[PDB]
Structure formats: structure tokens, C-alpha cells
Symmetry: D3
Subunit: 253 residues, 6 copies
């Protein structure tokens, strides 16, 4: 077996990838989402009730389907990153990255020694398919993709520095945390927030990195796609479930 | 503590109850559905991957919310009916009921001896809140609601006899099984099938029982409500989740 | 490895075994019970929300401790008896046994062909410790104990015939179902019910079988032990948990 | 999406398929087995501690890999067959089939009305990918494969009758149950047993059906493959795990 | 929907709330506790085998009942506090708080930017009921209650500074850790320890904060209630289960 | 009940203990390993998909069997160490220990105050059997065994200092991490790496501590036992499972 090819990572340079947020925290729900045809599925370990074991079950469901999995850990925690890479998550989205120093540590967290600090346990790992991928320890680093989130004033204050970190493949902008950080909590639609988001996307792409964002607003999502944003999540499974059930009931109240 | 009042059962005589099918088989998904405001939620133990323990978790989720839980067991299995009643399901929907003799057996399966054959285990049961409902063994039978499904030619061949069974509170028509039985598998919309459904609903109500049905077709659902159908399920969580994700992707393909 | 010795089964002829009902349906709760020192623990697959997998977890917990495990399946279902024996339950309590014919079928359900109808799958079974018990298929039958419950008028009507079945090790009287069947639901303490229980215990022991019963009433339990009842369950984990929390709150209201 | 093609079923006529028994009852263990390259993996619901939900998790793991899944239910139970088909098991191995009448009922259990009695619930089913396979109710029956086990004297007494049942794709011989039924429990290697197995395979193939068997004995397995046996399981995951760990310890005792 | 009202938080100023420790780490056991009528239930993520997912199941169970849930995380970990708030825990008890600086960080951990550092993920959260609480991000902070534990010499050394932190609603004294820190491990009943607890309670209340404590000793508990302690836990589910089973067995030995 | 004796700890001074790595992360798989007769079983919480709850289930499985459980947490996290000690892990293997200061912190993390910083929660803990071990808080520290891993250049740069820490019972060498740190990722067999391992084992034993290692290479394992290495793991469950299935398939390809 050759290592699983990270098509999400390759496509960061060749196309615009449409994503779905997966917060239903369940292998069965993850499989339903995997049938739809999204370019990527974000398995949310930060804001959905997930742990390593529930994330593994969702990787296993999704693996049969072309959709690429991206995992967001609860924080940029080196041991947790180690665990998520070993269960076979090839793309990580680190929340609340705020400095070049923190971004560099997240790069190292994803790479084996001697260049990185990723713990070695290939005999045990779904990532190597329990050494059925025979050259895994040589080929692993190449198919790993590191995305970091800028979603605080401190992150924006360190954007040029983060964008100069070799090994950051992409910067994702989270309008919820960012709008709240800017004192517009629950109102990311405000011009003050939007102008900052647009400038941030332009700077990301100007530094040769992939830009990403989430918007459930179709107009904002198509606007970000017209700017060239490489990875755009266009909704959230929990929101689509709740909204579809509410809209149906409303026809009968 | 007094026994939980089965408002679903009472409302069979006073209003038309709008329902949602719950096949996501998960306490977290069940809770999302419970927030919407459906009169009833059908926890599907026949066609979703549920067992006693996953149905219990969904009853516990839904219990904080006004929505009434109805449970469909995989078949009219007396021991399984005993297990679902003890975890505290107060309304059961029995699939594939085909005779008065079978319907009478389902009635007994729901009632304590000496009048029925429901096994006694009140010390252990969520149904009695572990005897915190102190008169449970005297008050239980009154808050249990039995629904049966007619979805075969044999059931339609025994409809008058089923409708004469004291203890059957409602007959639910399953258009999927029924249209397939009638040789229109996948096409319940056909006039031959629809005329049989309308006459069946009329005969059910004429005999003083509640009629029920599921249609995800808004027009058919509103037609069934115009006939006075007492319990109408108008959608399915798995279907709404898949369709909402597909419709969203299609805006970006 | 030699087959696990069924000490419960041996002690049916040598002492009076004190039991605890385990209906908390959980490996962790089962282990707490296992620490107390009861002779036997009844893992209730009939009136607690258990399945094969949760019963296995409770056998594994209890296995480190001297307490003997007894499993009650939901019904005398031959395939379910097969499953419980293969996960390693060496004593079964079959509810609602009503004839010599049913009791004989329960005997056969617990023995390998050619004498019985127990499905053969020793390579896969915790019962054989995956063939680490090398002579398991020769030695299994000796360490299996079959108990049946008489808890209906029909069972009482067939008691002499059930007591003549070679292979029934014990008859357990369930006062909840029996009092309900007799038209005293929730009031097993009535003299009419108690005279029938005493006569039943006497007949069981006169036929050389072990008699068993459950009572949470200390006085009734010690009365049953004075009669020579061989296996007496003296409480239920759910009841003791609920009662001890209620009694505590009452000191503070 | 077109229905998943049942390559196991097609290959019953074109090659000899090598199988592995999966009794570790776990999605993670099932994935390890799925990486090896077996033609088929038997997910054992009869002799391993599996339920519908654990079998679903193993189908999801295996689905990413070319190995074909076969599910053995605990018995030929029509509602359980319905559940296993809806979670997407395309090949079933029914234990302890003993008559043409029982084999015919198992055929019907796998086919939609009006020709069969498989319950219709395609909106809810992984089998239809929640109707993402748009013609599922028309295309399903074609990719379903029914295997039955002959493993009792009564089965052998009805072999010609079972082999004349249209819709039985294959007969699997279980040497453990059969050797025990013949009074050679734990010794299927005996000439009396082997001659019966060989004659049985010859009769199966002469009637145009696929023959199958399990042997962990390499010589017996290659002997059955030389006879033309179409589906041969050559070991058991629980046995290989236990034997590999025992052999390793023995080098160090 | 309006945000769930935190009645525990309100009652800190109006009454003395009686609590039960919940360490059985199970949704089913949590529901049994929920039925008793305690003012509050402490779901112990520090000393019982709980994770985010098992705490969620226990919140869902308890939510149907009047008892208020309080969650103790394993440590004052900001990302873990984020996760517990998003699953809907409205009151947190932070163990081993030792400085005003740590207490201030715990305050911030519970409030959205720009005033705090709580991660924003309202679309995904049971806390917002997946945005069915439409003004959640404006109304969340008011219904969150922060309790901190003082249970080390260093905490006692910083008590006045911790009591001056705006946003700490209550200080809970843990006599187990505190007696151990003081060199009386396992003997909190000693006068040296009790004088320090009484002085600590007095200082807490003098600073306008709520005081809390746990004692399974009825006399110590009523002494703490006579001092005006606002939240008093009076027992532990594991202890009551083990003690009630031991006391029962002792009547029969 | 007296505290469970840690025979693994005692045997560090009296014999050479043969170990098996347990990364199948499942109570059922752990039990299979427990039957084999290894001196110790390493429940891997670093490189297998385990959490506190799945490690507890494996401790409960293994507890019926002579094999001693050792738990590797994901990192030297003080709160996580507290959780694993309370579920009753008596021997811990800390990964990536790099200084005497870190080793001393791990010592304290394992000991109750006032000498250590282990949180006190004996009423709740399987470790105390919920206080059924009545003197647990006085007897606990004696049966806890602390192992640390040296697997970085920084650890080797601090080896003498780590070996001078009272409370470190053993130092385990992880050839995977170590060979990678040394710039021979995937090639621990290299003479440069092996000479460093031999000198390290010699220095560990010279300082009166137990030396440990894992090699799946029989020759290297027997070489390490010839040097007097006190605890030697000789295989990994996931590896043995995958290799045994692959070797079997290869006989039939
Ligand atoms: O896309 C963002 O802004 C995120 O980082 C996370 C997501 O959970 C939102 O907060 C939805 O509420
Ligand atoms: O409503 C009906 O027709 C049912 O009885 C069951 C439901 O599963 C549908 O068949 C969805 O496909
Ligand atoms: O002992 C009996 O009577 C039983 O067979 C079952 C037990 O669950 C009781 O019904 C408690 O309510
Ligand atoms: O192959 C057979 O004989 C079976 O039908 C099942 C299998 O479990 C064996 O009994 C192994 O013990
Ligand atoms: O109340 C306290 O002292 C605690 O903080 C925790 C509780 O677990 C006890 O330690 C019980 O042993
Ligand atoms: O023994 C070692 O080298 C370890 O520390 C961990 C183990 O996971 C191996 O790396 C297997 O790949
Ligand atoms: Ca289950
Ligand atoms: Ca977990
Ligand atoms: Mg964010
Ligand atoms: Mg139907
Ligand atoms: Mg009974
Ligand atoms: Mg068989
Ligand atoms: Mg404490
Ligand atoms: Mg290592």
C-alpha cells in the first residue's frame, strides 16, 4: 500500500474546494455528509462533542468516499495533534493561532523527528495502516496539510509573521470568533468586520498561502469564492438539520 | 411523582398531531429534533440502526421537551415490547399487523397481568422511575397508547377485524410497504394506491380509531390532514439532512 | 487453562447463596456490586436496558471477584441463550417458563449437540477463552447451570411436570409477576400469594431441585431462608441507589 | 450513485474467494482485517458479541477497502435480516437452515414485496445511501446474495430440497456444528465427518450452487479448494490473535 | 426559545442548596439521581471516569428534571471549559484554584470576547440549542456561574485575593484535598482542619461570595448549613450505592 | 480488602518481566491478550485510540488475570495522571521525559499531598474500590510504580540527572522515537543507535533503576534480556494481528 494521497492539500494550489462543517459528532451522520459530494468535510473537535475515538469513527465512515477529511482539534495541543495524526487525519485546522512562534510549533507538531516533534508509533497507527504502508515513516510528512485559524486581534497583529512560516499551508478565517474579538459578537456581516476579512484574504493569497473561510450566507460565500479563496465551507450539518426541520414544521405549524 | 401523562394519546381525540421521523439513531440528533416543536417524534427501531439502549438514550434526550415520543419496534415481538415499555416508551407503533388475533396479542403485550402479559419489573424500570412513581403498577396501563401499522394486502384483508380490537388506539398506514405490497414499489403516488389509502383512512376514522400516515410530500400530507387524519408525520430526519446538504452543494457544485 | 468452575451450581447443593439484582446495566456499576461480597449477582437482561454487549462488559467486570454471575435473558429464546453462553455466562435464569416441553427445550438450548442444540463456536467465544480452555467442548456442559422462573398460573399448573425435567437445576419464584398473575399486582405480601409461594418452595425442594426467590423485604427474605431456599436475592441495585439518595435528602429536605 | 455492486456474488461463478472470519466485534479490528486483501470478511453476528449497531460500524470500516463483507445473523430471523439489509449488508450467511421451506422463507426475507417480505424503508437505510441511490427499490434485489449453512443431520436430510430452492446462491458447511451433530464434537478431522463434507460439496456444486466452508487447517482448506469450493474461509481473527501472542510468549516463556 | 435560566446561580443569593455528587459516569445513573429532588447534581469530570461525551449524556438525562447540573472539569483548562460550556453546562466548579491570576483566567474562560476568551461556536452548541436560542451570544454570560475550589495551602494563602475577583460566584472547600494538603490525609474531622474550614467559610461569606462544601457526615453537613453555607453536597452516588449494598449483605452475611 | 499488590513493581527487583503492547483499544481485545500469560500488558494511551473510559474497560478486563497492567498516558500531563491513577492503573509509563525537573514533577503527580500533588478523590475511585480498601489513602503510594521514557537527545543529555530522581522506578527506552531523534527514523537496527541503547541500559542498571525496552525483533529482545533488562515488551497486538492475517493469506494469495 502507498500512503493515502492528500488531495485536499494538492487542490489548495489547483482549485477552490467547497466544504461542509461536520458537528453531529457521529460516524453514521458523518457517512450521510460523505455521500453528498463536498470537496472537504471539517470534523469539528473544538465546538462539537468529539474526542479522539469519535473522530476515528468519522474518519472510518468518510474514508470510503471521495470527500477529504479535515480535523479541527480543540486547541493547538502537541500531544492531541500526535493522536489525531496517528488515527489518520491528514489535514488539521488549528484554532486560535496568534504568533509565528505558535505556528512554527504546530508545523513541528505535524513532522517526525529530527525535523519535527511528532511522536513515532507507526506499528500502532491507522495512519500507517499498522505498517501495511511500508515506507510510512519516509512518506508521511509529504501528505500532511497544516491549516491555522486567525480569529483574534492578536492573530491579525501577527498575520505577516504567521504568513512567513514555512509549513503553514493555509490560513482559515473564523468570522464568529473574529467578529466577537472585534466587538461585533453575533454580527460578522458588519462592514468594519467584512473589510478586515477581505484585506486578510488578500494578504494570505499575496503571501502564497491558501485562504479559507466558513459562511452559511450564500452571498458572502460566493463573494469569498470570487476573491479566489481556496477552501470555503458553505454550511454546518447541525444548522442544516435544525433549519430543514423548522422550515418543514412551519408549513403545518 | 404521578405517572407521565401521555398527551399524544389524549390528543388523538382532540387535535391533529404533526410528526417527525427520527432515524439518526443517536441521543444528540434526537435532542436537535426535540427542539423544533413537533407534536410527536417517531424513534424508528424497525428501519434505523437502533436497539433498546440507543432508544433509551433518545427517550432521555427528548424527555426535557414537549414533543411526545413514539417508538416503532422492529416487529410485534412480545419480549421487545416489554423492554421498550420498561425504558419508558409510552406510545408504540407496531409494524406489519395483519390480523385481529395479532392486534389482540399486541394489546395484551402492553398491559400488566392479569388482563395482559406485560412482564412486571417496576423496581428496575425507567417507566416507574425506579418506583419513584409509587402507584405505577395501578396507573401504567392508562398512559400506554398502542398504534398498529397496516401495510400488507393481508392487513387490508383484515382491516374491519383489526378496527374492532379494543385496545388498538390508532392504525398507521405506511405508504412505502403498502405501495410495494400492491405491486407499485417506489410509487405510492399512483391513483390505485392513493384511492386505497383514502378509503382506509375513512374506514379507520368511521370505526372511532385514530388514523396515521407519513408523507414527505407536502401536498399529500395536507390532503391527509384535510381528511381529518389524527397523526401525520411530514418528514424524516435522515432525508431532510441529506436533501439540505445536497441542495446547498448544488448552489456551488 | 481448565474451564471456569461454576461454584454457584455446586453451592446449590451445599449452602444458601445470598444474591443482588444488577439492573444498572453498566460494567462500572457491576464492578461496584462485585466488590460487596454477594454469593451471586443477577445481570438482568429482561427488565434492565441490557444487550449481549453490555452483559459481556458486566461479566468482564465481575470476573475478577468471587461473586458468581447469573444472567437473565429477555425470554427463553434459543439463539439468545446461545449468545449469552458464548460470552461466558455459566448460569442462566429463564423467565416465564410454563411447561415441561419449554423447560426441556431450555435444557437442550444449554448443551452441545448431539445431546442438545447449543450452536458450536468455541474458537470465537469468551466461554472457551478463544480455545485457551483446550477441552472446552468436552467440559462445557458440566459447568452450565439452568434455572427457570415460575411466575404465571400456567407455570404453577405445570409445576410438577417442570420439576420432573432432568437438567433444570433450580426454579426461581418471581413474586412481582406471580402476584400480578394471581390478581394482586403490586401486593405480593398478601396471604393468598404467600401461601402459594411457601407451597411452591416446598414442592421444588421435595423434588430435589434448588428453590430461589427475590425479596427486598428483610423479614420475607429471612422467612424464605428459614424454609431452606437455596438462592435468595435480597435487594436490587437501582432500588438501593434510589432509596439511599432519597433517605439522605430527607434529612435536609 | 448506482447501487454498490456485489462482487462477492458475481465471483461465486468466476473464481474461488478466500475469506477471513471477523469475530473481534469492533470497527477498528474490522479495519485491520480489511487492509490484508481477503476476498471476503465474515462479520459474525452468531458467535461473536455483535448487534446491528456494532455490525454497522464494521461495514463502515470495511467499505473503504476491496474486501467484500458477508454478515452472519444469530439465526434466520426475518426482522433481523430486514435490519442487516437496511444497514447495507449485501451478502448474508444464515445459520442452521434445515428445510426447503426455511430456505424459501430466507429468500423472501431478502426480497422486496410483492415477490418477497423485506420491509421497505429506503429513506432511512444506509443500503440506499438514504435515497442517494435513486433507483435502489428497483436495483436492490439484484446485488443481494443469500448463503445458507447446512450444519445438522436434518439439514443433510433435506440437502437435495434446499439445493432446489431458487434464490439460495450458496450453501456453506460449518464443520464445528456438523462434526458435533454427527457425534464427533471437537473432531471434524475424522474420516466419517470428512467423507460427508466432500460428498456434500460435490452435491452442492452438481446442483449449480456455490459451496463454502471454513477450515483453519491449511491442508483441509487447500483440499476443499482443489474440489472447486467457491468460498473458503481459511482462519479466524480471534484465533490468529490468540495463537500469534501465545507463540511469541513461548519464545521467552 | 429564551436561554435556560440558571436557577442554581440565582439561588446562591436566596437559599441554601442541597447537592449530590454524581460519579457513576453514566446517563442512566445520572437520571436516577435527577429523580430524587436534590437542588444540584455535581457531574464529576475530575475524580469520576467522565469525558465531554459522557458529561453531555448526563446533562441530557438531568435536563428533564428540576435538579441543577454543576460540572467539575479535571482542571482549569481553558479549552476544556470551552467544550463543557458548549455542551450546555451552565455552572462549573474549577478544582485546585490557587491565585487571583488563575481565578481571573477562569472568569475569562467563561465569557465571550471581547470581555473574555470563550471560543465562539453557537451554531454547533447544545448551549445555544444550535441557535434555536436566537439571542444566545448576547444572553449567555448572564446564565453562566463560576465556582472555584480552594483545596491547597497556596489557595488558602491567596484566599483574600481570590475573594476579590469579580466573576467568581462561589468558593467551594474540598475537605479531602484540603485535609491532605494540611498533613491530615484521610482525617478531615480533626479540629486543626475544621477550624480552618469554619474561618474559610466565614471569610468567603464576608466577601459577598457563596461558600460551598461536601460532607457525607450528616453532623458536619448540618453544622456547615447552620453557618449559612450556600451550596452543601451531602453525599456521593458511588458511596451510597456501595454502603447500601454492604449494609444489606451484613443482615444476611 | 487490602490494596491490590503491584507485583510488576516488586518483580522489577527479582526477575525479568516479558511484556505485550496492547493498542487494540478495546476491553474484549485486552481480555484476549490477558489470557496469554504475559508478565505485563502495556495499555497504550499515547499511540492507540484510547481515552480514560476505554483504558478503564481494559483494566476491568485484565483484572481477572495474573498479567500486570501498565498504562502509557499521551503525555506527562498531571491531571491525566490523576485520572488514570483513580481508575486504578498502578504502573504508569510517562512518554518523552527530558529532565530531572520533569521526572520529579511526574513523581509528585503519583503521590498524595502533602509529599505529592495527586488529587484526592478516594470515595469515587476504582483505585480505592470506592473506599472498600479502607486504608487506601495511607497504603496507595507504596503500590504505585513510575516508569519514564527516554526517547530524545534531550533525555539522553539529562540521563544521569533523571537516574538520580528518587521515585523513578524504571526508565524505558523507545527505539522508534530514539532512532528518529538520532536521524535514523525507521531504522533502529543501525549500530550507531544500538550502541547508544546498550550504554543507556548499562547506565540505567548501574544507577539501581529498572531498564525497559520494546523490540518485536526476537534477536534484539533476547540480546536485551541477556544484558539484564528488567522489563522487555516483545510484541504489539495490532502488529501480530496484521502479520498473522497477512502470512495466512499468502499461503492461498
Ligand atoms: O467558522 C467559524 O467562525 C469557526 O471558526 C467555527 C464555527 O463553529 C462557527 O463559530 C459557527 O458558529
Ligand atoms: O412511513 C412508512 O411508509 C413506514 O412505515 C416507514 C418508513 O421507514 C418509510 O418507508 C421511509 O422509507
Ligand atoms: O423477582 C422478580 O419478581 C422478578 O422476576 C423481577 C424483578 O425485576 C422484580 O419484578 C422487581 O420489580
Ligand atoms: O465454520 C464453522 O464451523 C462455523 O459455522 C462457525 C465458527 O464459529 C466455528 O464454529 C469456529 O469455532
Ligand atoms: O469534596 C471534596 O473534597 C472534593 O473536592 C472531591 C470528592 O471526590 C472527595 O475527594 C471524595 O473522596
Ligand atoms: O516502543 C517504542 O518505541 C515506543 O515508545 C512506542 C511504540 O508505539 C512503538 O513506536 C511502535 O511503533
Ligand atoms: Ca448495543
Ligand atoms: Ca470517549
Ligand atoms: Mg472559531
Ligand atoms: Mg413500513
Ligand atoms: Mg418476573
Ligand atoms: Mg456453525
Ligand atoms: Mg478535591
Ligand atoms: Mg515512543
Amino acid at each position: 500500500m502507498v500512503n493515502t494521497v492528500n488531495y485536499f492539500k494538492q487542490k489548495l494550489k489547483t482549485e477552490q474546494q467547497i466544504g461542509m462543517w461536520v458537528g453531529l459528532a457521529d460516524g453514521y451522520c458523518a457517512e450521510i455528509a460523505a455521500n453528498v459530494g463536498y470537496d472537504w468535510l471539517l470534523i469539528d473537535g473544538e465546538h462539537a462533542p468529539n474526542d479522539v475515538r469519535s473522530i476515528l469513527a468519522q474518519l472510518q465512515s468518510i474514508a470510503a468516499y471521495p470527500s477529504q477529511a479535515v480535523v479541527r482539534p480543540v486547541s493547538g495541543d502537541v500531544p492531541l495533534i500526535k493522536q489525531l495524526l496517528d488515527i489518520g487525519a491528514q489535514t488539521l485546522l488549528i484554532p486560535m493561532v496568534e504568533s509565528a512562534e505558535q505556528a512554527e510549533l504546530m508545523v513541528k507538531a505535524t513532522r517526525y523527528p529530527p525535523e519535527g516533534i511528532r511522536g513515532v508509533g507507526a506499528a500502532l497507527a491507522r495512519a500507517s495502516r499498522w505498517n501495511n504502508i511500508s515506507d510510512y515513516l519516509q512518506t508521511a510528512d509529504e501528505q500532511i496539510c497544516l491549516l491555522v485559524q486567525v480569529e483574534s486581534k492578536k492573530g491579525l497583529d501577527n498575520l505577516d509573521e504567521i504568513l512567513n512560516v514555512d509549513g503553514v499551508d493555509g490560513i482559515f478565517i473564523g468570522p464568529a470568533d473574529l467578529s466577537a474579538a472585534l466587538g461585533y459578537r453575533g454580527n460578522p456581516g458588519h462592514e468594519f468586520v467584512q473589510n478586515i476579512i477581505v484585506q486578510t484574504i488578500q494578504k494570505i493569497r499575496a503571501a502564497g498561502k491558501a485562504a479559507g473561510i466558513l459562511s452559511a450566507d450564500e452571498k458572502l460565500a460566493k463573494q469569498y469564492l470570487e476573491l479566489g479563496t481556496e477552501f470555503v465551507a458553505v454550511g454546518v450539518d447541525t444548522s442544516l438539520l435544525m433549519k430543514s426541520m423548522k422550515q418543514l414544521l412551519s408549513k403545518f405549524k
